[PDB]
From TrEMBL:
Family to which this protein belongs: Belongs to the BPG-independent phosphoglycerate mutase family.
Protein name: 2,3-bisphosphoglycerate-independent phosphoglycerate mutase
Coiled-coil annotated spans: none
Organism: Acinetobacter baumannii
Residues that hold Mn(2+) 2 according to the record: D12, S62, D398, H402, D439, H440, H458
Binding positions for substrate per the UniProt entry: H123, R152, D153, R185, R191, R257, A258, D259, R260, K331
Keyword Amino-acid biosynthesis appears in the UniProt entry: no
Alphabetized UniProt keyword annotations: Glycolysis, Isomerase, Manganese, Metal-binding
NCBIfam families to which the protein is assigned, alphabetical: pgm_bpd_ind
Subunit structure: Monomer.
Length: 509
């Protein structure tokens, strides 16, 4: 104990946008942040596009963002890697993917492909899914696509062109493949142990169990829209005849992001699965995770992760320092394996506190979420003097911003601001240092002018970067997420490890 606290606050989904219209951050009462900015040095940093190793124009996200924050360097992203392999043709000869196809063919089964079907680019990309379908079709396989509909990394009603694209592909191999089922990502891609949701996707895939049937994918979507469902929440829909994932088939899950892929993957492959009582469990010829969703899941992986040495968490552990990771459960991955650079287990000296997210259908119903309890625990931790580094994620801006509901998003921002007043008080009393920042924007734009729909996605806006400490300082312009860890190490008066490539942004005065 008796340690000076260094606190990294990630206001998930809180960006800086000058425009006032539909800006829930500016509309919110943020007296603590306003006061902090008036007193303490503050700047803007970038968490989108090439600055975080993504294509120019691609919005940031929590996986890429927390990995960059923790790593102190820009990482080569799996999105890039897979896109490159498709471009060069290497994808189509990938031994793991080819093996899935050949094993299904040998068993006289089918290749079932599933994944988020949109151009969002956060968890998947439909062009990758086209590529996997083509890979299997060109090898003479029977192919069924199970589409998980988006509306969260894309506009809330936007699935139609994606479904049409895949229909058009299958039309080029007439009778050999088709879209079999559709369901919203709310069901298929849960990450907070809402197993009642996951079960709906699981039973659709394994039994063809559906709320509605339709003759075509687009007809299915029209039925969902008529039932007042948006893409994210589309109920289990079966197209045409039952096409079960059954014994001898192969499944390829085409998502490249881990957090929302773990639950449905476990439902298929985990030996003693306990999320829910499964009615049918197929013995697959192969189940492929496109990337490594979880080290302990016993299934082959197509694209294994690169080694990441001396992320901030690892490096502090190597120095015998202590650290806290704290968030609500919806952001578990973010403050654990995303921030740690891929490692799932605690480092020596690392403690985790995960507060259950509220047991509600959507977070516009409780925009304060579990932020107040997170704050209770964080303040206690800061005051204990037991931690050299404390990393907190506040989920609210991001999670409520994804609902597309402006008034709720305003309340989410207000909740975070109130909480930060208490964090500030504790840090100042302990003569500590704090960086308040974000991983990407979201809440600062709540209307999508390109579609006329509410805005449910991230933005490409810069994010705030506020330095709270015992003294003033100057902050260099042009910072990126990779600069945060070297900046923290400078505040801690600890040398930056060779593996970090970012720069210190802060000059104390
Ligand atoms: Mn985020
Ligand atoms: Mn988000």
């Amino acid at each position: 104990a008796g340690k000076i606290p260094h606190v990294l606050v990630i206001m998930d989904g809180v960006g800086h946008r000058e425009a006032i219209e539909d800006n829930a951050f500016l509309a919110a009462k943020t007296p603590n942040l306003t006061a902090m900015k008036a007193k303490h040095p503050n700047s803007l940093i970038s968490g989108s596009g090439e600055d975080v190793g993504l294509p120019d124009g691609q919005m940031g996200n929590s996986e890429v963002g927390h990995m960059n924050l923790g790593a102190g360097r820009v990482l080569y992203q799996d999105f890039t890697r897979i896109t490159k392999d498709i471009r060069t043709g290497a994808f189509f000869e990938h031994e793991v993917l080819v093996d899935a196809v050949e094993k299904a063919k040998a068993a006289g089964g089918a290749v079932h492909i599933m994944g988020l079907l949109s151009e969002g680019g956060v968890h998947s990309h439909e062009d990758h899914i086209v590529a996997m379908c083509e890979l299997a079709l060109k090898r003479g396989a029977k192919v069924y696509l199970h589409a998980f509909l988006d509306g969260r990394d894309t506009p809330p009603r936007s699935a139609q062109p994606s479904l049409e694209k895949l229909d058009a592909l299958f039309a080029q191999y007439e009778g050999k493949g088709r879209i079999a089922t559709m369901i919203g990502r709310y069901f298929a891609m849960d990450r907070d142990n809402r197993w009642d949701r996951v079960e709906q996707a699981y039973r659709l895939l394994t039994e063809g169990e559906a709320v509605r049937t339709a003759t075509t994918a687009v007809e299915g979507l029209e039925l969902a829209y008529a039932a007042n469902e948006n893409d994210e929440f589309v109920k289990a829909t079966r197209i045409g005849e039952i096409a079960k994932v059954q014994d001898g088939d192969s499944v390829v899950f085409m998502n490249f992001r881990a957090d929302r892929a773990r639950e449905i993957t476990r439902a298929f492959v985990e030996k003693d699965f306990a999320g829910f009582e499964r009615k049918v469990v197929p013995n697959l010829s192969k189940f492929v995770m496109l990337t490594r969703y979880q080290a302990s899941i016993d299934a082959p992986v197509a694209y294994m992760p690169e080694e990441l040495k001396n992320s901030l968490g690892e490096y502090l552990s190597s120095l015998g320092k202590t650290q806290l990771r704290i968030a609500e459960t919806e952001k578990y991955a973010h403050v654990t394996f995303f921030f740690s650079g891929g490692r799932e287990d605690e480092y020596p000296g690392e403690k985790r506190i995960l507060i259950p997210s509220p047991n509600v259908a959507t977070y516009d119903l409780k925009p304060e979420m579990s932020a107040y309890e997170v704050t209770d625990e964080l303040v206690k931790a800061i005051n204990s003097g037991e931690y050299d580094l404390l990393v907190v994620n506040y989920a609210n801006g991001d999670m409520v911003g994804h609902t597309g509901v402006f008034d709720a998003a305003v309340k989410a921002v207000e909740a975070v601001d109130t909480c930060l007043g208490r964090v500030y008080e504790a840090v100042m009393a302990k003569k500590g240092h704090m960086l308040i920042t974000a991983d990407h924007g979201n809440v600062e734009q709540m209307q999508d002018y390109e579609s006329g729909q509410v805005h449910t996605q991230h933005t490409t806006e810069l994010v705030p970067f506020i330095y709270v400490g015992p003294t003033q300082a100057t902050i260099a312009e042009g910072g990126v997420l990779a600069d945060v860890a070297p900046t923290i190490l400078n505040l801690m008066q600890i040398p930056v490890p060779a593996e970090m490539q970012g720069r210190n942004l802060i000059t104390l005065s």
